[PDB]
Design a protein around this ligand. Structure first.
Ligand code: HEM
Ligand code: HEM
Lengths: 364, 364
């Protein structure tokens, strides 16, 4: 139940080990007062400093004046930090307001339309996001709820997504989690300890063209429905052909061990690993950090489930976009559909107790 | 503890220790063939024996013939039994099939409509339920998903609810959970250790009038949304007045400790605890075994969260019905809304390796 340090050159929640639970909220800005929004950012940063340490926001959850609403809603009382990370991101639409147009990063690229998508606009986009990840779902919900409350009147929650379990790994020394198709997901990602790969593929640099984003990353979110009924009808061989790995061990086709490096030529030309591999994409590499979800039933007798895909990269134009383009022929496309999407510029870290979310963007 | 025995005089998941996570699914029957439904119950029981021991169903999740779909969908490979319990129940609607009408228990009473109810029929009812409780949500989800797959052609999933309580890896097992209103929830309840209280209040007895139910119990499910944002605007005194207990410690008004017995007369007349207490209900007492839920954000931007209330009782007419009726004037009603409901007759246990779910109802 240990805490994850909140301050750093980078925001936590990216290279951090992937926690068990996600609560992801996209917000829209409702205030037109730049000074009021800066004020909110600072109040949110202060709150996050408490939440990630396992403390109550403001003056606490009780012990105040009886006639006043408690500052903290209280449902995390008695709980540990639970590795909570809170990661803030700025969507392209934010840059139409507060006079931020010229500061919109070119690497914050709007996505093209991809064949087969059916994106729900209401659960796509967003002026900003907060990614709350923790090992305790009550800690994660509490953090989002209290941030939303602090922001009432200045921001609204556009859409949110809970992930009940991870489908990603930044720790190759630990067990790779399985997604709801039954396959390990996260074997060949980027590790928190891979500083050179993180610099090459995840962290933006000043010379990239957007100084305020130095030490930040760019986030692509994609809500992916899984055609479970169809998948569960597929043969074992078909399922393994789709990915290029065997199901039980998760090794590349022909190999004995999960982490043995793939020999792509041995997979089907439309195998997912073969098309997504960096070597098939001129070196493009992603830090995937997604989570499984379930959304009740489809109203038609079947569990409704999927994967909330999250990818961090130094530049969307050289990460998610080329890779997802190469997935146009992916054998996996028969079993999935992309149904929500959003991109965000995730700023650099909160340097210290005097700093605040967005300070490099908004100045001061 | 890592596992809970599947076999017994009673079904597990009622009096056994409360696990961290829930996947509750209601099923509807899609076959008229009684023998085919009995065959399913036998295959389901066989699967449950595997799942509650952390093993894959059938011949496994891999290694079979390449041209066959795997018997198990694989998403729990590498996980642990996680204290998984699988508890089956039969809804009133089941008894209109297979000639069972004259075997519906009188104690399986339909619930009256209660003041303020706003029940989504799509998330209510069901011919059957399976309550899957585990410490790891993916174990619970895997269990539901695979039972649903095994049963496909004979049953469908009507509705499905994920829930969470504490996270036991970081939260002391004796610490009362808090609900999403920030209050301790479960202080005065029946515990599975109180054998005499279970016999009095929870288990059906032969003399009660339905022999096949002897050693079973009756379950009431209620999906109860909370008006989170209005609640969080209420003063600390208003919130405590609603329950009759203070928020921080959870002690009854006028008392110092959580577990001190309440002086109901010092609570406001409409306080939840005063209205729900057995002394206010002719001694009616419930085994509450619910879970908090958070499903996301609704269309208005508000948090879709609440309590998935579950209560077990020897007779719905003498348990949940009187107590819920007594909540007509509950001050808590301002802040909650019941939005889904179902009742189930939970049969006695699977006695040994030759027994099967429902054998006392269907006959052997
Ligand atoms: C529901 C959708 C998806 C599922 C079930 C899925 C599943 C998998 C699995 C099982 C693997 C092999 C193990 C691993 O190395 O992680 C994999 C690899 C990978 N996937 Fe996906 N994936 C999905 C969507 C995506 C998308 C949208 C992208 C990017 C646009 C993507 C990019 C990658 C990459 C880059 C790899 C590693 C390839 C390598 O370098 O070997 N995946 N995925
Ligand atoms: C969102 C809805 C509900 C919330 C937030 C809630 C919350 C609470 C709280 C905070 C307590 C005091 C601590 C304790 O558990 O002893 C309590 C007690 C209790 N509640 Fe509820 N409750 C809800 C719905 C219900 C319903 C629907 C029933 C039954 C029909 C019920 C029956 C009880 C009982 C029997 C007690 C114990 C009273 C005693 O014997 O002292 N509750 N509840």
């Amino acid at each position: 139940g240990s805490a994850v340090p909140f301050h750093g050159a980078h925001q936590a929640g990216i290279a951090t080990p992937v926690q068990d639970r996600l609560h992801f909220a996209a917000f829209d800005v409702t205030t037109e007062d730049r000074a009021a929004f800066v004020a909110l950012l600072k109040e949110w940063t202060a709150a996050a400093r408490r939440l990630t340490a396992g403390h109550a926001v403001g003056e606490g959850a009780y012990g105040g004046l009886p006639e006043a609403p408690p500052d903290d809603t209280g449902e995390a009382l008695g709980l540990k930090p639970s590795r909570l990370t809170l990661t803030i991101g700025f969507g392209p639409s934010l840059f139409t307001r507060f006079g931020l147009a010229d500061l919109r990063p070119e690497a914050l690229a709007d996505l093209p339309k991809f064949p087969g998508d059916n994106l729900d606009r209401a659960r796509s986009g967003g002026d900003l996001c907060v990614q709350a990840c923790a090992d305790d779902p009550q800690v994660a919900v509490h953090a989002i709820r209290n941030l939303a409350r602090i922001g009432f009147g200045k921001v609204v929650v556009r859409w949110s997504q809970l992930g009940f379990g991870k489908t990603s790994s930044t720790t190759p020394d630990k067990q790779t989690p399985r997604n709801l198709l039954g396959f390990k997901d996260g074997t060949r990602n980027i590790a928190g300890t891979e500083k050179d790969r993180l610099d090459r593929f995840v962290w933006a640099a000043e010379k990239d063209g957007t100084p305020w984003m130095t030490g930040g990353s760019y986030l692509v979110a994609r809500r992916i429905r899984m055609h479970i009924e169809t998948w569960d009808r597929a043969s074992l061989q078909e399922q393994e052909d789709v990915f290029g790995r065997d199901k039980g061990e998760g090794a590349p086709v022909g190999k004995a061990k999960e982490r043995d490096e793939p020999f792509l030529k041995a997979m089907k030309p439309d195998a997912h690993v073969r098309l997504a591999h960096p070597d098939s994409n001129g070196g493009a590499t992603l830090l995937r950090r997604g989570y499984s979800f379930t959304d009740g039933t489809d109203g038609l007798g079947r569990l409704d489930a999927g994967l909330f895909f999250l990818a961090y990269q130094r530049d969307i134009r050289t990460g998610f976009v080329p890779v997802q383009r190469n997935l146009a022929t992916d054998a996996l496309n028969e079993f999935i559909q992309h149904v929500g999407s959003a991109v965000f510029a995730v700023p650099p870290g909160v340097r210290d107790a005097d700093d605040w979310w967005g300070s490099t963007l908004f100045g001061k």
